[PDB]
Every structure is written in structure tokens, then in C-alpha cells.
Amino acid sequence: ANPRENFLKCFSKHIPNPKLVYTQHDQLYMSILNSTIQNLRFISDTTPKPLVIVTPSNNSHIQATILCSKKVGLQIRTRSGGHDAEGMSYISQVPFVVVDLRNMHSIKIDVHSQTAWVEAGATLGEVYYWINEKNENLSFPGGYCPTVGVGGHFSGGGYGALMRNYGLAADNIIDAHLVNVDGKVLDRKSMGEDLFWAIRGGGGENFGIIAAWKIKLVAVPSKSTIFSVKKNMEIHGLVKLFNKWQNIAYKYDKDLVLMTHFITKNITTTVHGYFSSIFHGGVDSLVDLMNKSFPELGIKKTDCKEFSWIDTTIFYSGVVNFKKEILLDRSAGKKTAFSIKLDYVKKPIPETAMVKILEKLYEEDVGAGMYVLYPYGGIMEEISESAIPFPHRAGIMYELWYTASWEKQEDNEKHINWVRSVYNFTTPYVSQNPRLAYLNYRDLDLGKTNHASPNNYTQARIWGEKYFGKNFNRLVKVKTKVDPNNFFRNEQSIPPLPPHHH
Ligand SMILES: *Cc1cc2c(nc3c(=O)[nH]c(=O)nc-3n2C[C@H](O)[C@H](O)[C@H](O)COP(=O)(O)OP(=O)(O)OC[C@H]2O[C@@H](n3cnc4c(N)ncnc43)[C@H](O)[C@@H]2O)c(*)c1C
Ligand SMILES: *[C@@H]1O[C@H](CO)[C@@H](O)[C@H](O)[C@H]1NC(C)=O
Ligand SMILES: *[C@@H]1O[C@H](CO)[C@@H](O)[C@H](O)[C@H]1NC(C)=O
Ligand SMILES: *[C@@H]1O[C@H](CO)[C@@H](O)[C@H](O)[C@H]1NC(C)=O
Ligand SMILES: *[C@@H]1O[C@H](CO)[C@@H](O)[C@H](O)[C@H]1NC(C)=O
Ligand SMILES: *[C@@H]1O[C@H](CO)[C@@H](O)[C@H](O)[C@H]1NC(C)=O
Ligand SMILES: *[C@@H]1O[C@H](CO)[C@@H](O)[C@H](O)[C@H]1NC(C)=O
Numbered sequence: 022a023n024p025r026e027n028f029l030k031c032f033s034k035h036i037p038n039p040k041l042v043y044t045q046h047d048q049l050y051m052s053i054l055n056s057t058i059q060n061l062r063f064i065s066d067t068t069p070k071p072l073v074i075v076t077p078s079n080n081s082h083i084q085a086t087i088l089c090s091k092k093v094g095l096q097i098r099t100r101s102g103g104h105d106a107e108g109m110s111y112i113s114q115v116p117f118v119v120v121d122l123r124n125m126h127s128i129k130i131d132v133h134s135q136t137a138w139v140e141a142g143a144t145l146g147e148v149y150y151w152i153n154e155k156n157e158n159l160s161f162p163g164g165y166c167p168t169v170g171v172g173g174h175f176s177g178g179g180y181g182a183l184m185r186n187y188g189l190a191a192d193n194i195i196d197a198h199l200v201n202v203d204g205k206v207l208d209r210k211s212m213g214e215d216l217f218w219a220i221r222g223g224g225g226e227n228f229g230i231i232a233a234w235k236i237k238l239v240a241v242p243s244k245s246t247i248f249s250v251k252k253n254m255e256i257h258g259l260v261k262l263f264n265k266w267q268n269i270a271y272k273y274d275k276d277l278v279l280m281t282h283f284i285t286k287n288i289t290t291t292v293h294g295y296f297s298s299i300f301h302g303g304v305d306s307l308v309d310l311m312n313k314s315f316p317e318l319g320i321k322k323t324d325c326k327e328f329s330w331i332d333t334t335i336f337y338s339g340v341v342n343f344k345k346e347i348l349l350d351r352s353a354g355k356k357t358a359f360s361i362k363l364d365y366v367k368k369p370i371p372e373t374a375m376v377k378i379l380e381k382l383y384e385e386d387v388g389a390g391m392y393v394l395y396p397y398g399g400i401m402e403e404i405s406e407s408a409i410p411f412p413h414r415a416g417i418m419y420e421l422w423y424t425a426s427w428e429k430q431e432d433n434e435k436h437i438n439w440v441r442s443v444y445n446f447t448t449p450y451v452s453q454n455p456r457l458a459y460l461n462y463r464d465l466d467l468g469k470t471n472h473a474s475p476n477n478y479t480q481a482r483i484w485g486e487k488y489f490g491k492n493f494n495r496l497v498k499v500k501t502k503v504d505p506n507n508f509f510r511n512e513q514s515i516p517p518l519p520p521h522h523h
Contacts, residue, residue, distance in 0.1 A: 024093045024116060025072040031089035032075075039124075041082055043074040050074065053121065057103030057351075058111055059168070061358040062433060069112055071098070071119045078124035083230050084204040086120055091202070091508065098511070099230050102144055102170020106361055106463045109226070109511050110173065114472055120230060122172060123351075130155045135238045136195060137161075141172040141231045146338075150348040152238060153331045160241040160330055163190045165337050167348050175234055176225030177461035178411040182299050182337065185399030186275045187239045191222040191409050196235030199228070202504045206232070219499040223410035223489065224460055227496075227515045228503055241330045242301045248325035249297040249336075250318070253286065259294055260375045262317060266296065267369050269314060271398035271418050276301035277310065283392040285382045292379050298325070299333055357426035360437040362444045363462045364421045364451035365397075365413055374450055378443065385425065385439050393422040412490030413457055421451065422462070441466070458487045469512050476507075476516045485515060 029042060043050045053074055058064055072095065077083050090097050096117040100110040111119050122142030128151050130137040139148055146167025152159050162183035164174055171190075179190040187193060196209040197220060209217045216228060225231045252259060263281070270279045282295040296318060300307045304325055311320045328336065331345055339354035340347055347353050370378075382390050397417040406412040423443045425436045448456070458464055467484035470476075478497070485493040500507075501517040 024095055027093045028073055028089050028095060028118070031092055032085050035085035035088060036081060039078070041075055041077065043076070044072065045070070054111070054119070057100060057121070057123070057170075058108065059102070059104045059356055060106065060108060061356055061428070061430075062360070062437075063108035063112060065430065068108075069114065069117075071111075071113070071117045073118040074121055075118060076121050076124050080198065080200065080206045080232050083120065083200045083232055084206065086118065087200060087202070087230065088204045090118060091204075097230070097509070099172065099226060100170075101142055101172025102168055102174070104166070104169050104173060106359075106461075107465055107512075109463060109513075114512070122170070125232065130238075132156060135159065137236045137238060138233055139171055139236055140233045141170075143171050144351070145169050145171065145174065146348040146350075146353075148236075149331065149334050150345070153334075153345075157329060157331070158241060158243055159238045160334075161190065161236060161238055162187045162193055166354075167334075167338050167340075168351065168354060171234060172225060172231055174461065176220050176222065176231055178222040178409075178459070179461060182278060182333070183239060183241075185278060185396070185401065186301075188400055188404055189222065189409075189411060190236075191411060192404060193237050193239065194221055194234055195237045197231055198233040199225075199231050201229045202506070202508050209235075215495070215499045216503055218409060219496060219503075221409045221411075222460070223492075223496050223499070224514070226511060227500060227509055229509060243329060244303065244327040245330065245333050246300040246302060246304055246307045246325050246327045247298055247333060247336055248307075248320055249295055250320060250324060251293060251295055253291050253293040256292060256376055256379060259292060260372050260379065262294065262296075263375055264369070264372050265315065265317060266394075267366075267418065270396035273310075273314070273396075273398065275399045277307075279315075279396060281394040283379060283382065283394075284390070285387045288387045290383075290387060292382055297337075299337075303327060358428060358430070358433065358436070359424065359426045360440040361422060361424040361462055362440055362464055362466075363423070363459050364444070364447060365457045365459075366418050366421060366450075367416055367452050368450075369418065370447075370450045374447075378447060381439075381443050381446070385436070386427075389427055389436065390423070390425050390439060390443075393424065395420050395422075406490050407492055407495075410489050410492045410496060411460070412492045413459070417452075420459075421447070423447075455487050458484075460488045463513065465513055467513070470510070470514055470516060471512075472510075476519060478516055478518060478522075481516050484513065 099120045125140040126143040127140045165181045175190045199207045278299040286293045396419045402415045500515045
């Protein structure tokens with residue numbers, strides 16, 4: 022009796038006769054494993070590999086895997102788009118199998134009722150595309166990156182351009198299909214409201230394997246206006262603009278998103294701020310708005326085109342500059358090694374301190390580090406904190422991402438340490454009790470939950486409280502109820518409650 026072969030037998034038993042199981046012996050193993058590992062940082066020979074990969078195409082397949090891993094004693098890591106910031110969807114410390122959902126990417130739109138059934142392995146890109154094909158004036162609220170998978174994205178909250186208008190993708194989910202620790206398939210009805218609440222932004226990896234979402238589509242203007250302007254002046258003049266942006270961006274009506282980037286340019290060199298818009302409306306209203314609200318930014322008509330939504334979608338994603346069918350292409354953009362961390366901001370950062378933050382970009386190579394800033398007003402002020410597990414709503418001015426991408430496996434420690442040091446540095450200026458963070462940018466630095474350690478609950482709280490709010494209690498309530506033996510677990514997952522505290 023050994024687990025790989027015992028698994029495979031059990032699986033065959035539950036399901037006789039495409040390929041659904043891969044082992045190291047299969048020619049395709051490696052390139053499947055590899056295909057969707059998004060962060061090159063976790064591609065080494067040292068990196069643990071699973072005993073089996075399964076690629077289900079049917080709820081029945083998922084039930085079997087869950088059942089068989091339960092029996093033989095393997096751990097599951099589900100991979101949907103593979104974008105985990107920490108590789109947590111494809112690495113484990115213990116013998117494990119990855120459940121790659123790439124074969125379950127069906128997307129079924131009901132144009133009239135304005136809903137859609139999207140399977141767990143589809144990618145934003147696809148969702149965007151196929152919605153737009155059915156109707157140019159429709160879409161869905163979600164991240165910017167087309168290759169993000171909907172399993173990780175939605176169950177983690179997930180948001181982007183439409184955030185200020187409609188909220189997080191998790192805010193717009195009507196139903197789902199989920200398989201639990203007992204291998205049952207559950208709709209919302211049968212799931213019950215606690216579990217339906219939980220999977221919407223509490224991390225699906227804590228409760229089960231989601232198989233499908235039901236999605237409610239949102240209205241989207243047939244023309245939006247985009248400018249995106251370069252600003253490489255002297256460092257102080259730059260922050261003078263930043264400070265202004267900081268106090269107003271979140272204040273616009275719902276129809277303006279104004280975001281900002283920072284990086285270094287000129288290879289051997291100066292800090293550059295880019296300021297970008299999605300404006301639901303025309304060129305002139307927009308210039309007028311800008312000319313009124315933010316003169317010093319000095320945008321002009323010459324500065325901005327008006328695009329269709331899907332074009333805007335494209336403009337604002339990881340692909341150079343063409344045609345809209347890239348949205349469909351699993352292997353677009355370039356994969357890099359990356360480290361990212363994100364802060365939320367409630368109170369304007371002091372101009373002095375900000376130069377210092379910007380000053381730090383000089384300490385890595387040109388283009389390596391980058392700060393992304395997105396504003397936080399509009400609808401987020403009216404959505405309750407416990408509406409869903411994701412609790413970051415009212416009184417946030419904007420969010421700050423600090424990110425580094427590189428190529429080379431040696432330069433790892435160097436680069437992740439930079440990201441940390443900027444994080445450490447900004448600590449006085451960002452949110453505070455507690456320092457809020459975002460489940461979809463997992464940060465093991467916030468604390469780890471170990472395989473080889475007894476499960477202290479008050480330990481998990483430290484980070485549980487950062488990712489979620491007051492929401493954390495209800496979350497551990499749901500865990501304890503639906504997966505009391507903590508079968509669905511990872512290096513930073515919600516623990517159940519031990520039974521003497523039941
Ligand atoms: C790589 C990348 C990520 C981005 C980018 N832009 C984002 C943005 O603009 N807004 C955001 O809110 N998030 C952005 N993200 C990050 C993604 O939101 C997160 O990285 C998601 O968690 C990624 O989801 P996914 O693409 O599926 O990657 P996986 O590694 O497979 O991570 C999934 C995560 O959750 C578990 N899981 C996935 N699917 C399921 C199902 N069906 N059931 C249970 N659990 C599931 C996995 O185990 C893993 O833990 C821009 C870029 C470039
Ligand atoms: C795994 O990924 C790395 C970089 O993408 C690459 O060197 C290697 O060829 C990949 N594995 C394959 C093709 O089996
Ligand atoms: C899921 O379960 C079985 C196994 O193949 C099949 O009868 C059913 O139609 C499947 N549904 C799909 C592939 O949509
Ligand atoms: C979408 O919106 C515009 C703005 O009113 C309208 O003129 C256009 O005809 C619409 N088309 C569809 C297919 O909904
Ligand atoms: C911006 O405002 C000034 C008036 O102070 C004006 O001269 C300029 O033409 C305005 N912009 C547009 C687009 O008209
Ligand atoms: C960041 O802060 C933590 C906690 O105080 C510390 O352990 C770590 O070394 C710091 N990282 C730096 C200074 O880069
Ligand atoms: C959880 O609580 C205990 C008991 O008071 C504490 O001492 C310990 O540090 C925590 N447990 C673990 C495993 O870290």
C-alpha cells in the first residue's frame with residue numbers, strides 16, 4: 022500500500038474511462054505543472070512537486086479527488102489561474118496533489134436575465150471577452166489581469182476598474198457550486214448562507230473546491246475616456262502632484278477612476294509618475310472636470326481617447342501597447358519572478374515621507390520596483406463591512422501596492438527584501454489598528470500556520486484580523502462547522518476551533 026498508486030486506483034474506482042490524472046511518468050506532467058505557475062520565484066528543482074496532478078472536467082471528478090485524498094492521506098492544493106503571490110496553489114510541504122481546473126472553464130451567459138454561470142477554471146480575460154461578445158454594454162467587476170483565474174480571484178474578493186461603481190467581484194456573486202470535505206456538491210441553497218458568505222472573499226482554499234460561480238453582470242458605458250500621462254520632473258514637484266491626487270482621487274463621482282503608478286526610467290535615471298483615468302463619459306466633460314478639479318495635472322484634449330469597455334479592459338492589463346482576442350489567450354503577458362505587498366491608506370501621507378518612499382525606487386534596478394496606487398471612494402462607502410468576508414470599505418482614501426519583478430533566481434532574496442524594507446518603512450503612514458491587508462495578495466510575512474505545530478487559534482487571529490475584519494470570528498465558525506478536521510489547509514489558512522472550545 023503506497024499513496025500515489027493507491028490514490029490512482031481509488032480514483033479509477035470512483036471513475037472508470039480524456040486524461041484526468043498525471044504523474045511524473047507522464048510526458049506532460051512538467052509542462053502542465055509549470056504551465057500556469059505565474060511567479061517564476063517558485064520554479065526551482067528544489068520546489069516540491071505533487072504526486073499527482075488531476076485536471077477534472079466534471080463535478081464528479083472533484084468529488085473523487087477529495088474523497089481519494091482523504092482516504093490515502095494526500096493533501097489538496099487547487100489551482101485555477103495559478104497567480105498566488107506565494108505559490109500556495111501548487112506547492113506543499115507534505116505529499117500532495119494539485120487539482121488543476123483548466124478543463125472546467127465553461128462560461129454560459131444569459132443575455133436577458135444578465136447572469137452567467139462561470140466554471141472555476143475560467144480566467145477574467147475569458148469572462149470579459151465572452152460577456153462583451155454577447156453585449157458591448159455589459160461586463161463584470163474584477164481584476165485588471167486577464168490571466169487571473171476566477172477560483173482564486175473571486176473567492177478572495179477580487180477587484181479593479183469597476184470597484185468604485187459596483188464593488189468586488191465577490192460582491193456580485195449570486196450562487197456557486199462547491200464541493201466540501203465529504204465530497205458533496207453544493208449550490209447556495211444547499212450550502213446555506215454562512216458557507217455562501219464564507220466563500221465570497223474568505224478564500225475558497227479554506228472551505229473546499231469551488232466548481233462554478235453564478236455571476237450577475239453589470240452595466241458598462243459604450244465609451245469611456247482614458248488618458249495616461251507621464252510625469253518625470255524633479256522629485257519634489259512630483260510629490261506636489263501626488264499630494265494633490267491623494268486628497269482628491271477618492272472624492273470624484275463614481276464615473277472617474279484616477280490611478281497612479283511610479284517607477285524608475287533611464288538605464289545605466291529619474292523617478293516617473295504616471296497618472297491614468299477611466300472616465301465613464303466623453304473627452305470634453307472629462308477635460309472640463311480635470312481643468313476644474315486638478316488643473317496642475319495639465320491634461321488636454323490631445324491627451325485622451327475614448328474607448329469601448331473591452332478596449333479599456335485591454336489598455337489596462339499586462340500586454341504591450343493589439344486586437345481584442347488576446348483576452349482569450351491563456352499564455353499572454355510575460356511571467357516574472359515577483360514579490361508584492363499592499364497597504365490601505367486612511368490619512369494623507371506626508372509629502373516629506375513620500376519623497377523618501379519614492380527615493381527608495383533608486384535602490385533597485387531601473388524598472389524593478391514599482392508602486393501602484395488606486396483610489397478608494399464611491400460605492401465602497403456604502404457596502405457594509407460584514408456584507409462579505411472582505412471588510413475594507415468605508416474611510417479608505419486609496420490602496421498602495423509595492424511590487425518588484427525580476428528574472429533571476431539568485432536575485433530573489435535581494436528583491437523580496439527590498440519589498441519588505443519599503444513595507445517596513447511605510448508602516449507609520451498606512452492603516453494602523455490593525456494594519457489591514459488583502460487576501461488576494463497573500464503575505465506569509467503576516468504569520469504562518471504550520472503543518473508541524475498544534476493549531477493555536479490566537480495565533481491565526483493576528484493575520485486573520487488583518488485580512489478580514491470583525492469578519493474573522495464568523496469565518497472560524499464556518500471553518501469549524503464545515504471542515505472540523507482541517508483537511509483544506511495551507512501555510513496560512515483559517516484553523517478550525519479545537520473541540521474542547523466547541
Ligand atoms: C498574478 C496576478 C495577480 C493579480 C493581478 N491583478 C489583480 C488585481 O488587479 N486585483 C486583484 O484583486 N487581484 C489581482 N491579482 C491577484 C489575484 O486576485 C490573486 O492572485 C488570486 O488569488 C489568484 O487567483 P488564481 O488566478 O486562481 O491563482 P491560484 O494560484 O490558482 O490561486 C488561487 C488561490 O485560491 C485557491 N483556489 C483557486 N481556485 C479555487 C477553487 N476553485 N476552490 C477552492 N480554492 C481555490 C488556490 O488554492 C490558491 O490558494 C495581476 C497578476 C499578474
Ligand atoms: C518550466 O519553466 C521554466 C521557465 O518557464 C523553463 O525553464 C522550463 O523549460 C519549464 N518546463 C518545461 C518546458 O517542461
Ligand atoms: C458530470 O458527471 C458525469 C461524468 O462524466 C456526466 O454524466 C455529467 O454529464 C457530467 N457533466 C458535465 C461534463 O458537464
Ligand atoms: C449601448 O449604449 C449606447 C449609448 O446609449 C447606445 O447608443 C448603443 O446603441 C448601445 N448598444 C447596445 C447593443 O446595447
Ligand atoms: C483650462 O482653463 C483655462 C482657464 O483658466 C483655459 O484657458 C483653458 O483653455 C482651459 N481648458 C479647456 C479644455 O478649455
Ligand atoms: C520588518 O519588520 C519585522 C518585524 O519587526 C522584522 O522582523 C524584519 O526584519 C523587518 N524587515 C526589514 C527591516 O527589512
Ligand atoms: C497559543 O497559546 C498558548 C497558551 O497560552 C501560547 O503560550 C502559545 O504561544 C500559542 N501556541 C502556539 C502553538 O504557538
